[model samples]
Target: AFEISDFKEHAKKKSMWAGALNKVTISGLMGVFTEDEDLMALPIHRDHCPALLKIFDELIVNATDHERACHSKTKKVTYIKISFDKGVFSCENDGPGIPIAKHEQASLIAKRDVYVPEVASCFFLAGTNINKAKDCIKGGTNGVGLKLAMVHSQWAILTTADGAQKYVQQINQRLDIIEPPTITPSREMFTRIELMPVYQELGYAEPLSETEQADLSAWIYLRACQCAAYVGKGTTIYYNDKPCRTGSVMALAKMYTLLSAPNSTIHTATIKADAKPYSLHPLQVAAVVSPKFKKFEHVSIINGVNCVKGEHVTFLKKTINEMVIKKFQQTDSCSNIFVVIVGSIPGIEWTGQRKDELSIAENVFKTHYSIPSSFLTSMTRSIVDILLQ
Candidate 1:
């Protein structure tokens, strides 16, 4: 009964607005997602406690990075104490604690009020970076690792002491707000964090089975060893009061070599790029290779993160295989090859929240690192000689 023009006019009048273009442009657009939704999206492992190793990873990396930045040379030995008691996990480090002061400049930069003790608040807000240096390699770039650990747990506590005053803040389960900061006198500089992870969130039963506990313990211990190894000398980590023996990078390579092939001879070498245009910083690579490994075992540690497979790993594996093939005049079986590479590269990139893989700029990698020809020759000759025998 209604005409086309009459219907159109009625519809147009009912609409909120009329636009000539079909598409609409939005400015300052942002995705609206809740914290729980974001946490669920992370690559959390269902096989084990979702927050155990990852939380440990974040805390240990931050502690080690802090130590390296401040007292890598001054502190003869940096001690990191890790303990798991009952259902709670705590990591304590002897690094310079977070300063307790109202940072007016940072507050202005953040467009709000900011305090040194407000680091707890910073944990609630994602993408907050305490360290602003961009050139130096850091274990955490996403800035969500610590926040994830805190919010995933039922409750969390952060205690920091700067050798004079100590600040403590406890976060509730809902993560709505933290209790008022408690300040007290202290004579030590340390940062301690404690959290009680929710087992249901990790897909585990209330109490883990004996085998599961054993498995968790083993994985934690292995990571502790790797962390100690990457931290090099002047660093010691304790797991439940048990010490992890950590020395130089070369020493770690040898240890891994022995673990892979106990009877094989350990061939180790170190190379560094000249701090010129070729490199942004002193990029160092240490390698340990041995023959007669029962199975192919390659362990790569880049910027203190134990990477499973990444660009650097691929490069090392290919380079080693190429040299072996060139000199031995035979195909590399790779079964009897065991190599461990520990490298420190500036501006390293982690692949994901798990931080099990890494990437670096192609130019930086190609120019900043190369295996020594003589060392390769030595390695090939010995390996070939052993294979022939």
Candidate 2:
């Protein structure tokens, strides 16, 4: 086992969380994320750009992570298909389809852990913080991935392969098992998440043009690959019939290797798994070597979900941060460095809803899943040691 003391040579630091802090409201429906302390702001805090971005995020996360979740004997391909003409976004996984059951926050017949991921459900009846961090360390944590998208959607369709069952629900009501789809194909068990987003509605921000949609879709795939560090084989992505470029851990590793700094040699690391081994490298290094990064230092992928911090490169873990940071720290690179931690707080006990006139609040992002001070201390120490090394 790796020891915290062993990471003495390595140390810690923090992403595209850029947005104007504005007070927004939508009568009795939506509220502002900047001011609201309630969980309902789960969908609110997300700007319209990110709302579209999350669609790609959740789809890829589900598509790739679902493969891991099933742990099937044979690896199944994950397919994400979007039809702008039909105004629909669909993510399909060939893994064992979810068994029909009740979904309360995190309770699902398929979820192996967390009865309810720390969530803000007012928007979608049960918004969860994706899932547990360990699940983040794994592949798919759902960590509030689909809840907001669901709330913001006009209607969503959930289909399982076992039966022709279609569970379609509207914006206001809880998801109810509905009529079977007209087109039913049975083969390997799978899950299809069908969503249709409103273009000019409250959360829609503004309508997306065809070109913008295409750009957003392609970028989302690359973004998912960069942030999630995922590259499941046989995964196919289509945006209105045009195949989009997908990034994977291996592809990122190659991208990082192309980076060159004063004394830095771009290197790549191999990520282990049941399927094929994917690759990983530092994007901060890319900023050093290439102007292509456009100065976006938000290292997005850690484990498998979105990272606020670039700590994906752990202390002495397979990819060492010290070697990378120290080499560039001496170069002519920008010295304004910041360290932020990524990964959701697995679960935080909240101020449950009360019977008062005004309800109490819950869903603090930082404490969504509590982390002890020592855990942070050790992480920082290790990271600082690396930079200093």
Candidate 3:
């Protein structure tokens, strides 16, 4: 038998991932597509829009993370521009473009000790260090989101300028082949990714209906709203030349007010747990208390990915429900509350390959899942104030 490092070299020769990378599955893609009953009935296969929407979420998060990695508060503002046309999604960012140097892990992956292009490492490798800032609040934890898009899409084209060389590469045969990139001299710094989703894989065999395309467009708009609501004030994401106008959690509250109740009161809290020593980021919860709803509504976004469930969401909802029932002495006291929780944590533990649901890191959450009493008290007091008014 060969040595362990030799085994890794043999493995890399067969596939760049070497059987270590977790691939996105059809079931995982269906988890996003099957959420819409109408789309499921389209008898088309699935709505297809929601699955694509989730992929777009991954792309936007990746782009924004790049922007954040390249600048601090003192630096000039950054922006990301995205466009979808003719079944293609194009995203461009102003950041320190992807590095073009050869990675240092060549000895482990190659028998001859040949270097790996930073570009291939970024797209084919499961985890890479494009965002190398330690302790920095970033969206990508495993670094596979962008790779998922590249592998699942029909084709992907990447172009970058890292202030010196211009690099371009394309992946074909569904990420089975990686062509050698062309590099030329350049002084600009930017990164752009263009890809068209695979129709059959996404449950579409022909061009999508006008309504189906509209569904994707609406999803994009809603994502822009949520993105604007949480992204740094100095950053902007433009879709089709339109700037995302809604910023701040309260803006979400106001929009819900216009949609459901005119007198909705907003309450928000920043939560730092007792495990602060082990935590890399803080959790925030926002609530819009309206009088019209007959039940509670919950929304959760973590690390820039919208999710269906999380401890942060559940804890907030439970606390508010307990407070409302106690104060009002009614079983339906939580009826009018709409809760939105967002967390920008590092080292996220995702529940599945799709990155939909995630658990807070054990270091940050502890084994028993307890929260600080200070946070509970603040939330209780805020709810009490809203009910009193």
Predicted structure with the largest lDDT when compared to the true one:
3
Worst 10 residues of 1 by lDDT: 14-23
What's the CA RMSD of model 1 in angstroms? 13.0
Please give the lDDT score at residue 329 for candidate 2: 57
Candidate 3 residues lying further than 4 Å off, grouped into runs, are: 1-46, 49-51, 71-77, 104-125, 129-136, 272-284, 330-332, 361-389
**Alpha-carbon deviation at 92 in model 2, angstroms:** 1.8
| Candidate 1 segments exceeding 4 Å error | 1-46, 49-51, 72-77, 103-114, 120-134, 249-260, 276-295, 330-335, 382-389
Greater-TM-score candidate between 1 and 2: 1
Model 2 lDDT per residue over 1-389, tens place: 96452110110000011111122331211121112421111112223344444544555565655544443456455555544444567665565555444445354433532211112221223332333542223433323445545544556665555444333323322222222233344554666666775444433335666644544444544443343334344555555554444344333433332322223322222222221111111222111223332332333343345444222323222123333455445541222112222222222121211100111123221212223334333433434444454
RMSD (Å) of each candidate, 1 decimal: 13.0, 15.3, 7.3
- Candidate 3 per-residue lDDT over residues 1-389, each given as its tens digit: 85455322342233332122222232222111123321120112333434456557777777766655654644332778888777788787876776777655653554333223333334343445555454456666655566656665677888888788988887654566666678899998778888887655555545866755655655565666666655666778787777766566666555545545655556777666544433535666667665565677665666667666566665556655676567555424465677766657655565754566667743345442455565555556555665776
Which residue pairs clash in candidate 3? none
Write model 1 residue lDDT over 89-185, tens digit each, in one string: 7878876777877667657766765666564334433333546455665565655556655655678888888889998888756354556678889
Candidate 2 — what's its lDDT?
0.37
Candidate numbers, best TM-score first, in rank order: 1, 3, 2
Cα lDDT listed for each candidate: 0.58, 0.37, 0.59
> After superposing candidate 2, which stretches have Cα over 4 Å from the reference?
1-48, 75-86, 101-144, 163-185, 203-207, 210-215, 224-229, 234-250, 253-266, 271-298, 313-389
